Amino acid sequence: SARAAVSELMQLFPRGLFEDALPPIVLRSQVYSLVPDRTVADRQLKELQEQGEIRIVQLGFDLDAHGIIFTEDYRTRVCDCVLKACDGRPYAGAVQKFLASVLPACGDLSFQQDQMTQTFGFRDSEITHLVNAGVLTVRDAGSWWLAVPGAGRFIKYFVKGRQAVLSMVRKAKYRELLLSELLGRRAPVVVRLGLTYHVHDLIGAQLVDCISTTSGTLLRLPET
């Protein structure tokens, strides 16, 4: 089941690297890595998201980047860090209202102005309060995506780590490399999140061909 897979992948998250300010984040593609049946993976993730255990957030760095976060890690980290760094500055109350009203209700990826203006009685001032909280970011005029405060650091590290790992596979012979060889290899300093994490992401997005050989699963770059 996808629920297990997200659990193990969430364990791989090096929380210390982000000083426990960011809740652990799992990319949907990595969920595809451990669960080859892509369709069943998506159905069960939708099941979980409806149940309210997890949230899905548009990370933006790629149009197909959806980060998966346990709802309770999201609430805990946002309340703690935001209210602490923002004790007194006004949007703390607005964010409290948001976490109390919207997140339990709708797990939807995007938020449109009409919903917050009417169903939730949020004002323009309060919406700007959230936007400065980091909790919303602009999709369009009057449209905003859910967001984790501080995600930029994780995004930058993930992007550089992914490209570094892909480069390491490229520079191996054939543009090929065995998975065990990669994992045992000393990680570059650019790769700050750990190699298993990035390897799952590459395999899941079909950026690297997984070839099951007698020596194990080989990584090969598909011919571009």
Footprint of another protein (CB under 8 A): 173-176, 223
Q: How far is the CB of 215 from another protein (least distance, A)?
A: 9
Residue 21 or 178 having the CB closest to another protein: 178
Nearer to another protein by Cβ, of 105 and 211: the residue is 211
Positive/negative CA dihedral, 208, 210, 211, 216: positive
Nearest to 205 by CA among 42, 28, 57: 28
Q: Tokens 């967001």 map to which residue?
A: 147
C-alpha 62/C-alpha 33 separation (Å) is 18
- What are the Cα distances from residue 102, in Å, to 110, 146, 207? 12, 11, 36
> In this structure, are residues 73 and 112 in contact, taking their beta carbons and an 8 Å threshold?
no
Whole-angstrom CA distances from 212 to 31, 46, 143, 183 are 19, 30, 45, 16
CB contact burial 34-66 (16+ within 10 A = b; e otherwise): bbeeeeebeebbeebbeeeebbbbbbebeeebb
As measured in angstroms, the least distance from the Cβ of 219 to another protein is 14
**Quick one: 112 or 215, whose CB is closer to another protein?**
215
Strand-strand pairing, 54-58 and 66-70? antiparallel
Nearer to another protein, 176 or 181 (CB): 176
Q: How far is the CB of 168 from another protein (least distance, A)?
A: 16
Least distance to another protein, CB of residue 183, Å: 20
Residue number with CB closer to another protein (87 or 223): 223
- Smallest gap, in angstroms, from Cβ of residue 214 to another protein? 9
Phi/psi for 96 (5° steps) reads -60, -45
Pick 51 or 215: Cβ nearer another protein: 215
- The CB-of-217 to another protein minimum distance in angstroms stands at 16
